[PDB]
Design a protein around this nucleic acid. Structure first.
Lengths: 51, 104, 147, 223, 124, 186
RNA sequence: UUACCGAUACCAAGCCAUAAAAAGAAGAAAAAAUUUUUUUUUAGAAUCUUUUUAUGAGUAGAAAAUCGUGGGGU
RNA sequence: AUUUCACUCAUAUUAAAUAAAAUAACUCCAAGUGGGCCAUUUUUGGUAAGCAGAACUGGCGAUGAGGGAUGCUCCUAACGC
RNA sequence: AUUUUAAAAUUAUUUGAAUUUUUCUUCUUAUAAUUUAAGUUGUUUCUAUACAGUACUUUCUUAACCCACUCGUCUUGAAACACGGACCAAGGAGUCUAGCAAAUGUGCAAGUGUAUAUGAUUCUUUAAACAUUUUACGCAUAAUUAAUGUAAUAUGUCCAUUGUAGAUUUGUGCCCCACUUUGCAUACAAUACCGGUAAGCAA
RNA sequence: UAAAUAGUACCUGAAAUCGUUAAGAUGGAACGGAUUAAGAGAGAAAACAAGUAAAGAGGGGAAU
């Protein structure tokens, strides 16, 4: 087959999801991790250091 | 036997009296068989290699019709003869005739 | 056929394909076979060992016409005669061919080959070999002298 | 004559789901390893005992000098280890014999422990694959999984994260994966080397030698 | 410098001249490959009559076609029959050894054939 | 640059085209190479390769050897790339089915009388394109005389190379280095 | 100690040539006017056509494709 | 010691590793070549020499590109556009 | 014009479920399109409302930043304070023959070549083509020894020496590999058999 | 006389060389390679206009 523009397998979301079937799951988990509030850490910063 | 349609191609492709090359533009190569719908030098279209074929050409002022064994004839009449001896190329030949007609 | 020569491909090459440092000189080694036993001896000793020295007694005027004797192996005898006569001779168990090889132009009969078992043949030749005679008589054939 | 297309489609779907499960197990394994190493080091510090982690068993190596003016043994070892250009890079298994032959090429190379993010980046970004018939490979970028399943899927490693795991952990399959994977072509650094002409462990600035955990930083500009 | 015009991409101009053809009349501008020993050009010194090589060859997908996006083809007396079909691809040039009468008839036939002519105004 | 043997260009060895400028054979190779390309049978590949060999490697094969080699299985058809020569050293022949390029009128008459038929490569292609029930044979390649001058140089210890000589008398290359009496021997 | 400038080396892309490689001995598309006309093509050449990859230095030296000149049949 | 039979010794990563390992192996025909030189290291004679003579390797010659102001051999690096 | 398709993702439905616990949360049952898929597409001007111009493409001459030592030659080393070259036009050098070998192509093939020469309503071109009554010769079919000379299994049977691999081939588990069948060519050997010379015998 | 730029060095009349006119350049070499910019020459075959109505000159072939 003809060679096409080789899509950047590192940023192009569609081709990356084609390559790794679980990337959208992993990124959704990352978004859920990052989308948390700040009061939890604001009140656990000591609890995770005094221990 | 001793000759065949495929056979004659390998004797004509090099040494022929009807092949004209283009000295200035090397891409040019043409074949002037009076049984060629198109002048491309190929064994799938050359008049002297096809089992039976036909086209339209000019012969000293008038358009002349020829059908391969080599019957010589003289637009409605053109199409009626074409369907009389019919076998893409049909409409291409009709278009070729209509373009060749305009020429003096 | 001159433009097919190798030289016609090296017109602009100064050396003409005969070297630059060494240069092309007339008769470098020496004219003819001059290098025998002095400096070209390695070639003779490597490709034509027995070239030098003389061996054997002398035949004064050989007159090769005397000892001329074409040779035929014993197996080709059947092939000499036509194949239809071969078939009829093979068919019949009462007739055997006679091959006077002098007519064909052959003189000696040699024993190489393998004849057809249980079939006699008559042979007439100026000379025979012992093994050829053994082969011929082992299958009922006969060797007949001629001159 | 048409059932084949749908059968192939279900085959593709099955492969996709199996690869999904495989990469989930691999992601489990990575975090398990990190937790284990952290807790083991903490326990070691808690008690009066010491904990050392074994060498990573896989080393990424890059060639530094050109082609001219090399010892014949050095050039033979380069050609045997597949370091042909001046910025080619390859992975190598760690064995005492392999390290011994690397010892006679240390001055012209830079080798170290991979780490996971940079090996993933190298596979996705600069990765290239031998595709065709043997000795006629005709290097080609990955962009897919069809060819990798076609030639390498026999050993049930069809996919890309399968390659990622099989590389970051010294597993059953190296002589296949490393032979399959064309030598990485690397871009010059974003800032530059320190000194091609001096060793790294020398107090003077220099680069050639053993970099262990540091190689990932320079790879992040090699890319 | 490479010249870019439409789709034909030419990589070089300034038809190459023989080395030393400047200060020696007997050396004609036609290019040759000097053999020499210490002949500079063979050594490829920095900036001195660089020599032709295969790399300058244009793309075969567009190689021989003329700025008219159309291959040229020579004609002599009446040989226009093989031109009827490919009128969009081949332009026609009259051979320089054609008299005025024959050239006039050729130009007459070609203009109504609707095929361009290069040297239309030749010897008239 | 790169450290590659032969700068990384694959080099083969052999004929890349038929230098033989003969229209019928050119057509024939156009047929068999196409058969090899389409099919997956090594038979067509081998026969297409063998139709390209030089004249010195499609050697004659004698009727005696051909019949001897078919003596094991009688129902198959022989394919030999070169021509087959008739041998007068043979007495009778039995029901042989062959396919070769050229023949000899004596051999043709002999085989027709035997009752077989001369299959030409066109008939071979039309009948058995998959190589079924056909055994491939070729005559002795290296038995030709020019190979008698090959190998170790004549004059090498334990060499068996015919040396170029104008004749074979008693004064032509028979004295020095060949008999113990005159210097060494061989 | 950073930051920099710095190659016909390196990387990405394009094109040429060589070598290898995968493969091959018959059908309508679009646009513009206004359903009908016009406008361009409708390809099949095996020492070829399509496509992929790699490589690309050279004196003496060898081979191939080539371009011309005096003639000669065709 | 030989022949024929038993039986079977990892072979699914392949009787260690790694291998653009079959760009191999062979045969034939043939040109040039057959005055060398420089460099790190070893070393002979001579006080020494840009000397005379050897050694493992690389270059130069056969080769340009960037640098050492400049240089046949130094450093980087070997050249399609 | 029979992989610019498949899925891959996105939207909007629907399906069951899930879990990190929900507005980029994920896995598909079924639907229709989008493209981040499946190598740059669209919009507005200008060229420009002209037939040669100041524009546009190109040749040439001038300048400008950077670089660049007279070529050819023998030479380890050439620009050399090494040699030939004031300039121009024409001529100017790996050819021909005998013989051999090798490579290639062709015909024929155990035969091959028709040599000198012969016949012919050939007898501008024809100093070429055509043709050659039932072992002429060269080269090859069989070698070997100074040499008189001798001369390749051996009549059990038109089997055609024996091994190790080895191309094919017929089949078992119309496309692989393992199992028996044939064993090309060749490679490495072994056997016989002919001449020669030894040795034993020897009418 | 068709031509005298065919005028007895008489078919064509290149090169080294020299002359004239024009344009340009000119601080111990000139010429050049690669990139241009300005000038001076030329140039319509892509460098815009197919068809549509009318009239001037032409032309052709089929129909009888």
């Amino acid at each position: 087959k003809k060679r096409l523009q080789n899509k950047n397998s590192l940023t192009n979301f569609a081709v990356r999801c084609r390559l790794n079937p679980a990337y959208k799951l992993l990124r959704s988990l990352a978004v859920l991790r990052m989308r948390k509030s700040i009061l939890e850490k604001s009140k656990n910063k000591k609890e995770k250091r005094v221990q | 036997s001793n000759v065949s349609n495929a056979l004659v191609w390998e004797l004509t492709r090099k040494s022929n009296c009807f092949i004209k090359k283009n000295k200035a533009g090397k891409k040019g190569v043409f074949l002037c068989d009076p049984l060629n719908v198109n002048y491309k030098n190929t064994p799938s279209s050359s008049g002297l290699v096809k089992s039976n074929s036909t086209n339209v050409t000019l012969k000293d002022g008038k358009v002349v019709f020829s059908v391969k064994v080599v019957n010589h004839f003289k637009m409605k009449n053109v199409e009626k003869l074409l369907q009389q001896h019919g076998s893409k190329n049909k409409e291409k030949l009709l278009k070729k005739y209509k373009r060749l007609s305009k020429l003096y | 056929a001159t433009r097919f020569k190798k030289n016609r491909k090296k017109r602009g090459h100064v050396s003409a394909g005969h070297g630059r440092v060494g240069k092309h000189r007339k008769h470098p080694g020496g004219r003819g076979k001059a290098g025998g036993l002095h400096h070209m001896r390695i070639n003779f000793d490597k490709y034509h060992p027995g070239y030098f020295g003389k061996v054997g007694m002398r035949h004064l005027n050989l007159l090769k016409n005397r000892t001329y004797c074409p040779t035929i192996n014993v197996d080709k005898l059947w092939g000499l005669l036509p194949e239809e006569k071969k078939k009829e001779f093979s068919e019949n168990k009462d007739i055997a061919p006679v091959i006077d090889v002098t007519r064909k132009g052959y003189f000696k009969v040699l024993g190489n080959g393998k004849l057809k078992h249980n079939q006699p043949i008559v042979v007439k030749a100026r000379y025979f070999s012992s093994v050829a005679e053994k082969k011929i008589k082992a299958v009922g054939g006969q060797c007949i002298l001629v001159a | 004559a048409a059932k084949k297309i749908k059968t192939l489609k279900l085959i593709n779907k099955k492969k996709r789901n199996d690869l999904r499960q495989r990469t989930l197990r691999y992601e489990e394994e990575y975090e398990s390893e990190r937790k284990k190493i952290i807790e083991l080091k903490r326990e070691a510090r808690k008690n009066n005992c010491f904990y050392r982690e074994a060498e990573k068993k896989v080393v990424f190596v890059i060639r530094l000098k050109g082609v001219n003016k090399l010892p014949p043994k050095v050039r033979s070892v380069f050609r045997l280890l597949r370091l042909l250009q001046v910025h080619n890079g390859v992975f190598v298994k760690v064995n005492k014999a392999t390290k011994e032959m690397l010892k006679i090429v240390e001055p012209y190379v830079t080798y170290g422990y991979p780490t996971l993010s940079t090996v993933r980046k190298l596979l996705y970004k600069r990765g290239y694959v031998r595709v065709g018939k043997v000795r006629r490979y005709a290097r080609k970028k990955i962009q897919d999984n069809a060819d990798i399943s076609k030639h390498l899927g026999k050993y049930n490693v069809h996919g890309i994260e399968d390659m990622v795991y099989q590389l970051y952990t010294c597993g059953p399959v190296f002589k296949k994966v490393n032979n399959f994977l064309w030598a990485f072509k690397l871009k010059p650094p974003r800032k530059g080397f320190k000194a091609k002409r001096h060793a790294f462990n020398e107090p003077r600035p220099g680069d050639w030698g053993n970099r262990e955990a540091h190689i990932n930083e320079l790879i992040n500009r090699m890319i | 410098a490479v010249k870019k015009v439409g789709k034909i991409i030419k990589k070089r101009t300034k038809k190459f001249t023989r080395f030393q053809s400047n200060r020696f009349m007997r050396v004609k501008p036609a290019w040759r490959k000097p053999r020499g020993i210490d002949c500079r050009v063979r050594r490829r010194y920095k900036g001195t009559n660089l020599m032709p090589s295969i790399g300058y060859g244009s793309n075969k997908k567009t190689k021989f076609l003329l700025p008219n996006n159309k291959y040229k083809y020579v004609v002599k007396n009446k040989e226009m029959e093989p031109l009827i079909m490919n009128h969009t691809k081949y332009c026609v040039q009259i051979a320089h050894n054609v008299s005025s009468k024959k050239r006039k008839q050729i130009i007459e036939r070609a203009k109504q054939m609707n095929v361009s002519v290069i040297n239309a105004k030749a010897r008239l | 640059g790169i450290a590659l043997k032969n700068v990384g260009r694959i080099k083969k060895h052999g004929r890349k085209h038929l230098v033989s400028k003969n229209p019928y054979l050119r057509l024939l190779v156009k047929l068999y190479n196409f058969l090899a390309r389409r099919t997956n049978a090594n038979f067509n590949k081998i026969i297409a390769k063998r139709l390209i060999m030089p004249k010195r490697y499609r050697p004659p094969l004698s009727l005696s050897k051909l019949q001897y080699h078919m003596a094991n299985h009688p129902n198959d058809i022989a394919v030999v790339v070169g021509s087959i020569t008739d041998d007068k050293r043979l007495f009778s022949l039995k029901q042989l089915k062959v396919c070769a390029l050229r023949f000899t009128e004596t051999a043709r008459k002999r085989i027709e009388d035997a009752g077989g038929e001369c299959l030409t490569f066109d008939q071979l292609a039309l009948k058995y394109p998959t190589g079924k029930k056909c055994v491939l044979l070729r005559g002795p390649t290296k038995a030709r005389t020019a190979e008698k001058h090959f190998g170790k140089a004549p004059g090498k210890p334990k060499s068996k190379a015919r040396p170029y000589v104008r004749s074979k008398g008693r004064k032509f290359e028979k004295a020095r280095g060949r008999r113990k009496s005159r210097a060494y021997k061989k």
